[PDB]
Amino acid sequence: SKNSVIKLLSTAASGYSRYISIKKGAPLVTQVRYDPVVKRHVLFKEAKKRKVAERKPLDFLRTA
Amino acid sequence: SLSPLAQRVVTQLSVMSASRKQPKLLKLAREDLIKHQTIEKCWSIYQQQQRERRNLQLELQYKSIERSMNLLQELSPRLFEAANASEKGKRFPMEMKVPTDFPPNTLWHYNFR
Amino acid sequence: HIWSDFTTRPSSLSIQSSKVKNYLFQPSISRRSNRIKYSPPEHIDEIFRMSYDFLEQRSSKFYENPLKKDALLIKAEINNPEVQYNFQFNNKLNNVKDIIDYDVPVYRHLGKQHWESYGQMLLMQRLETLAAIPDTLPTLVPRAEVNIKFPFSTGVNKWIEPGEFLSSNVTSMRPIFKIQEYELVNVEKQLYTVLIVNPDVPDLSNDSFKTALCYGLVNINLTYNDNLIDPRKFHSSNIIADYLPPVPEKNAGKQRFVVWVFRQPLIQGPNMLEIDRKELSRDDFDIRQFTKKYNLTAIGAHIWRSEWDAKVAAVREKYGLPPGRVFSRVRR
Amino acid sequence: PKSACSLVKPVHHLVKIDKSKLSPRFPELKYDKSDIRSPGFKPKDTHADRLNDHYLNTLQSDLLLINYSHNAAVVKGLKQRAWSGDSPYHLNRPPKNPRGSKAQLPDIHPIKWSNIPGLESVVINCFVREARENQLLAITAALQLQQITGCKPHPIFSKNDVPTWKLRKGHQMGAKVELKGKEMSQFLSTLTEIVLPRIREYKGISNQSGNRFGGISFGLTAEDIKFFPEIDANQDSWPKTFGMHININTSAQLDYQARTLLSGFQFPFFGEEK
Amino acid sequence: RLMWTFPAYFYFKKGTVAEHKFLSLQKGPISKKNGIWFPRGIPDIKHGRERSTKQEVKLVNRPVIPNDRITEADRSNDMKSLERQLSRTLYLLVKDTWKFPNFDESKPLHVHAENELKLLSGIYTWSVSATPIGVFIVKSHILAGEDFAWLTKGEISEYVPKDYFNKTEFLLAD
Amino acid sequence: TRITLPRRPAKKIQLGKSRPAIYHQFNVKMELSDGSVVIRRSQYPKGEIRLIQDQRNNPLWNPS
Amino acid sequence: NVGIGKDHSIFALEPGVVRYYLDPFHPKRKFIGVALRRDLKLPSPHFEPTVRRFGRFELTNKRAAYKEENSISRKDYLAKPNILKQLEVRESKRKELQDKLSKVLRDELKLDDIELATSYLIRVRASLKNGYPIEDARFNSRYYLKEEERLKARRESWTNEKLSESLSKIDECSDLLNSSTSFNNKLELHQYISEQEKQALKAKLLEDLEKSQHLETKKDKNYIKALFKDACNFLTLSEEVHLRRKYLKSVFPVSRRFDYTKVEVIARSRRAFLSKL
RNA sequence: AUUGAAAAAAAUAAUAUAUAUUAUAUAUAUUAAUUAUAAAUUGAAAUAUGUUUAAUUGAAUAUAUUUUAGUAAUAGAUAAAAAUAUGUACAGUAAAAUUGUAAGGAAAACAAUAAUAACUUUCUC
RNA sequence: GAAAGAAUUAAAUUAAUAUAAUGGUAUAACUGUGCGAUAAUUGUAACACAAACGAGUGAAACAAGUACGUAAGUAUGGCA
RNA sequence: GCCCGGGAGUCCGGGCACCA
Ligand SMILES: [Mg+2]
Ligand SMILES: [Mg+2]
Ligand SMILES: [Mg+2]
């Protein structure tokens, strides 16, 4: 109920995916991991789109 | 955005913060730095000397006191006992002020009570 | 005004550059624009002068057995700004006589302090972590720095950081040591020895390792300023085991080459010692035993480590050695 | 992570090794906090501390004199008691906690030339309680503290939870400042010359306020804070003011000594009988 | 040099008369303009201060004038005066060689001493403690107004025998 | 009901680059009840301050 | 010789005999360890050398050995070709340098063995480029060659006399080079200069500079440049740079600047950059 | 480099430029930046250009151009209030109880509460 | 004789451990902080413990890449 | 998981797959 599964696809287009579980609110996940096809680390990104529990963009530039 | 009180509070906070108020850290030429270091060392040495002086003086005083006590016990026992009487509640004059930077209008008092 | 005088006091205690001295006494930052930009702190002059006067006075007061005398001298000098300037802002490794004399005690002391601050510590760490000490020689107490170099092969210039990996090319020909002594020792009568040992060569009989002595100098004369052990100095009489290079066998781990420096036992002139150059077994070699025999006291050490590579075969060939064994990749 | 098992391998040398120096990571951090090269540098002896001078010249000797008993040796206080070995169970047993209390107590050394009572440090804690509701109050209090002292305070957060009062952990409430050296002396002078006098009905510090190992404490109401110079000059600027506690740590072995020392600096202890 | 900027915006209001007055006393820092050479570095100004350099701030109602720290000097005579060396510790000394007020068994010693000296003038002293010092000497501190003579620690060395000075040198503080 | 100032993302003070708080202060002249002047370093902008109610006039500090 | 897993399970890292012990270094801790052989006790003497196993066997079987020799890390394999290429390039460069040196020698007219001399020169140059006093560098170079010769002799079981002769020849060559030739500021080769001579030259240059510190024309500037053009042969690099900084000041003592008085606009004598630049 | 002030160079490190080597070295030069980051009509400052007055100076005031003011914490390798639960690197100790202190107590916050034998450096008889 | 440093000894302990109970833990696994979001990666896993089988548990080593670390090394999620 | 009814978000009620 809280934790859904998601598929993370290699940004190098070897089509090697890896799966992980996250909370429903969880931010858009990416993680760099080893891709055995390309034989080097690469970024893995969410394949399917999903709504995210929106967080306010914290302001570094002293606004107002 | 914010109430006047809030603004005031913010200002107050800023007064304490180092935000935008602090200057750039002072750099030094090598020679200058060396000179500074030397000066510091000298100062330290002076301080140490002063401490020794004072400490030494204190020690001497203590020794003197001890000697007196030794004499006193030998000589007048009652007197010695009286001298010993522990000062558990002793408290400084209060009229005996702390040194100021510049002296007062009446530079000393004659009449009292 | 003792620091102004230079009769008995060596000339090295002053700043050799005149401009700098002038600046100090009433700058260096080369560029004109930068100089213009610069703004020193106020009231530095008079206060500085006062400080100098104070410290000079102290030095004078200080001024009056050998070690004690040396110590006193050091105490007197240290606070001299000029000496500080010299030490801090000029190179201690490739020392230059007149700028920093290690004949002069103050400078020596400063050097020692510097060593203690960093390099010595680093060396110690390397020894401990890599298991140099307990494995070869029980312990040491630092005493003197020892910096090695491999100038002849390749041709480049670099002081080796302790516990580095050197290519077989680099360590193909012999090294150069600089044993920077401190601690008020005799110079005429005191001799030294230097041993490059590697304790991890594969013993197949026992299945453990055995320690080889790959390079051995004895009865070397040193000087506080002149301490580079080049073929100029030592001569062929001083070599007990002539240099053999690191030639690690394939898959025989990382062989640790640990250079030890010892000082001779002291009894009129320079006391030598014979060491049965032929009899001494170098292929398998007991360091501790050797030390016990000749009563050495290990002052300083340095270390590097070698691994197999394509180049080693060539090196072996050059040196006229066997082709070199090859070991299984598994630690079975 | 596989291990989870802390075990330092023993070494084979007596060289100390200050790891930080072997790392090139924090090159500014390598220097002392008083070496000019460091960004953490600030000057210490900006001018002379008059109060400290007074202590050194006049008071210290007096203190040495007055405290001196004849051949008073250490009356070492109550410690952890070892177990009588009249049974085998005592063998590897931890010792008995002190006869009097749970905590172990220090030895009282005689007042000689080497260890005369002195002022060590002054800690001011202003726990504004109304800050449970309004967090801006805390900030204001901190500012006030800063104004009073001239050295950065540190925030005091609510360490406990309790329903009866509206108190929940993790809530900034008040400010705490540690005063030392010349600054502390200055503060004390300000307290004594200006504030404590000006406060209307003040009969002096209470004589029971001894920490018992030579520490003394006293309060100041929200009204008295107006009497400080940095606040008095602008009453328009300070609508709300906050009361505070003041703790004074001394090199004194016992409370009475400490209070005597304080009296030397013009602190009226007419509050009570010891 | 290292101080923070003076935060005038807190102390003084941005439309006040006092604030205006304050501003009038102050002179600003030379700002930067595109097209000019600043050979002393470019002005790094933030919050109304050049970061590069030290920054200073100019400032019954009455100007506070301090009293002179030298009345003794003016006097140039009164060795029997208390308002003499104000920033120095003084000690009472009496003539006969000449020395500290000696006074020659039912009472406690310090108390007796106090009593003895109280009679010679009519002054107000405070004994530091019953504990004596030296050969039996008591210490005491004055609070009110053969020779009544007052001296510093250095001045006494000239006015007394060497041996005596040696005996009681460590008593006389600076 | 909890009235707060909602914090910004704070500034990272690097290790070694922390500069100690040297607040701007003036060497103020403090005149007491009597003519005794005393110097103290204060953060408020004022050269001179004379005082009406001080320790020197209060009976508790002096029985004269 | 004992490991510890996630459960705090103790396991053997090496073949051997299990022992339980108390270690003095760690009071109030019980230890399990593996002694490498039975006879010896396990809380082993702290300073005595640590008994290691090694425990790899050597590939006698020749094919296997060959295979082992062949096989290397993947990283090495990846970056080997590149490395080789780099090496080749370096070699080429060296060859070129050697050729240049030879040409220079020919121009000079010095006797030469020639190849050896060239090699020596190159070595010296390399040393110079790296941080070495020149004489010392030369010596080092000589020594390298000597060492090589010795090695060769050892390899081929030479008649020592021959070796000696070779050494002598080498020494002679070095002397010839040392006396005849010397590298410069910019690491190019020219005819030799002694120390005193060099000093004299420097002095002369200084004098010239002093004389002609006006520079009131293009011609003058040109002359100055020409004069500078021979400075490398008798001057250190840093010194030369300093000199250049001093005397080819891009401008001499229409813009605008600031001053301590109040802005200050300056037109300038416009013959300060035309001849300068 | 030109402006100020009144022959050169000899560390570490950083930056710029070059080259040496199947060695992350060396040579030359210089020592920058160290809490900043968009968007403000009335806040403040500076400079440039005018007019007036006691060739210039100061002062007043006008216009232009810029600079500041968005005010926001910890300033310490922070250490038992909250917030980050996995890696590594470096560091440090908790809790209770007792004695105290404005409101403040059974129960808010802060402070204090074990031994210096030996050793090193510094200052001193 | 003093100051400072390095400490050392004693007490360590029920505080704290994402979570029950137990065992552990200051040499800290507990806490703080820098960097880092990387070992909460990819092929072979011997050999043990446990075990009817199905399963489970610890895990050396080989190879590929990554993170932190001056280095030694450490990391195949969480003190168990 | 997908589709509705009461730009985004929350809170509720319908369906439509999944149902080995
Ligand atoms: Mg437990
Ligand atoms: Mg963990
Ligand atoms: Mg099974």
UniProtKB/Swiss-Prot annotation, chain A:
Example GO biological process: mitochondrial translation
Subcellular location: Mitochondrion
Cellular component annotations (GO), alphabetically ordered: mitochondrial inner membrane; mitochondrial large ribosomal subunit; mitochondrion
Keyword Mitochondrion part of the UniProt annotation: yes
Alphabetical UniProt keywords: Mitochondrion, Ribonucleoprotein, Ribosomal protein
Other remarks on this protein: Present with 2500 molecules/cell in log phase SD medium.
Described function: Component of the mitochondrial ribosome (mitoribosome), a dedicated translation machinery responsible for the synthesis of mitochondrial genome-encoded proteins, including at least some of the essential transmembrane subunits of the mitochondrial respiratory chain. The mitoribosomes are attached to the mitochondrial inner membrane and translation products are cotranslationally integrated into the membrane.
The name this protein goes by in its record: Large ribosomal subunit protein bL33m
Organism of origin: Saccharomyces cerevisiae (strain ATCC 204508 / S288c) (Baker's yeast)
Lineage summary: Eukaryota, Fungi, Dikarya, Ascomycota, Saccharomycotina
Curated annotation (Swiss-Prot), chain B:
Subcellular compartments: Mitochondrion
GO cellular component terms, A-Z: mitochondrial inner membrane; mitochondrial large ribosomal subunit; mitochondrion
Keyword annotations from UniProtKB, A to Z: Mitochondrion, Ribonucleoprotein, Ribosomal protein, Transit peptide
GO terms classed as biological process: mitochondrial translation
GO molecular function (one): structural constituent of ribosome
Principal location: mitochondrion
Domain of life, source organism: Eukaryota
Note: Present with 6300 molecules/cell in log phase SD medium.
Subunit annotation: Component of the mitochondrial large ribosomal subunit (mt-LSU). Mature yeast 74S mitochondrial ribosomes consist of a small (37S) and a large (54S) subunit. The 37S small subunit contains a 15S ribosomal RNA (15S mt-rRNA) and 34 different proteins. The 54S large subunit contains a 21S rRNA (21S mt-rRNA) and 46 different proteins.
Physiological role: Component of the mitochondrial ribosome (mitoribosome), a dedicated translation machinery responsible for the synthesis of mitochondrial genome-encoded proteins, including at least some of the essential transmembrane subunits of the mitochondrial respiratory chain. The mitoribosomes are attached to the mitochondrial inner membrane and translation products are cotranslationally integrated into the membrane.
Family: Belongs to the mitochondrion-specific ribosomal protein mL40 family.
Protein name: Large ribosomal subunit protein mL40
Organism: Saccharomyces cerevisiae (strain ATCC 204508 / S288c)
Shown residues within the full chain: 34 to 146 of 147
From Swiss-Prot, chain C:
Compartmental location: Mitochondrion
Single GO BP term: mitochondrial translation
A molecular-function term among this protein's GO annotations: structural constituent of ribosome
Principal subcellular localisation of the protein: mitochondrion
Keyword field: Mitochondrion, Ribonucleoprotein, Ribosomal protein, Transit peptide
Keyword tRNA processing: no
Domain of life: Eukaryota
GO cellular component, one term: mitochondrial large ribosomal subunit
Gene3D superfamilies registered for this protein in UniProt: 1.20.58.1180, PEBP-like (3.90.280.10)
Record note on quaternary structure: Component of the mitochondrial large ribosomal subunit (mt-LSU). Mature yeast 74S mitochondrial ribosomes consist of a small (37S) and a large (54S) subunit. The 37S small subunit contains a 15S ribosomal RNA (15S mt-rRNA) and 34 different proteins. The 54S large subunit contains a 21S rRNA (21S mt-rRNA) and 46 different proteins.
Family named by the database record: Belongs to the phosphatidylethanolamine-binding protein family. Mitochondrion-specific ribosomal protein mL38 subfamily.
Function, as annotated: Component of the mitochondrial ribosome (mitoribosome), a dedicated translation machinery responsible for the synthesis of mitochondrial genome-encoded proteins, including at least some of the essential transmembrane subunits of the mitochondrial respiratory chain. The mitoribosomes are attached to the mitochondrial inner membrane and translation products are cotranslationally integrated into the membrane.
Additional information: Present with 7700 molecules/cell in log phase SD medium.
Protein name, per record: Large ribosomal subunit protein mL38
Swiss-Prot record, chain D:
Primary location: mitochondrion
PANTHER family: 60S RIBOSOMAL PROTEIN L11-RELATED (PTHR11994)
Single GO molecular function: structural constituent of ribosome
One Gene Ontology cellular component: mitochondrial inner membrane
Origin organism lineage: Eukaryota, Fungi, Dikarya, Ascomycota, Saccharomycotina
Alphabetically ordered keywords of this record: Mitochondrion, Ribonucleoprotein, Ribosomal protein, Transit peptide
Record-stated family: Belongs to the universal ribosomal protein uL5 family.
Protein known as: Large ribosomal subunit protein uL5m
Organism: Saccharomyces cerevisiae (strain ATCC 204508 / S288c)
A UniProt-annotated Pfam family: Ribosomal_L5_C
Complex formation: Component of the mitochondrial large ribosomal subunit (mt-LSU). Mature yeast 74S mitochondrial ribosomes consist of a small (37S) and a large (54S) subunit. The 37S small subunit contains a 15S ribosomal RNA (15S mt-rRNA) and 34 different proteins. The 54S large subunit contains a 21S rRNA (21S mt-rRNA) and 46 different proteins. Unlike bacterial L5, uL5m does not bind zinc.
Compartment(s) where it occurs, according to its Swiss-Prot or TrEMBL record: Mitochondrion
GO BP terms, alphabetized: mitochondrial translation; translation
Function comment: Component of the mitochondrial ribosome (mitoribosome), a dedicated translation machinery responsible for the synthesis of mitochondrial genome-encoded proteins, including at least some of the essential transmembrane subunits of the mitochondrial respiratory chain. The mitoribosomes are attached to the mitochondrial inner membrane and translation products are cotranslationally integrated into the membrane.
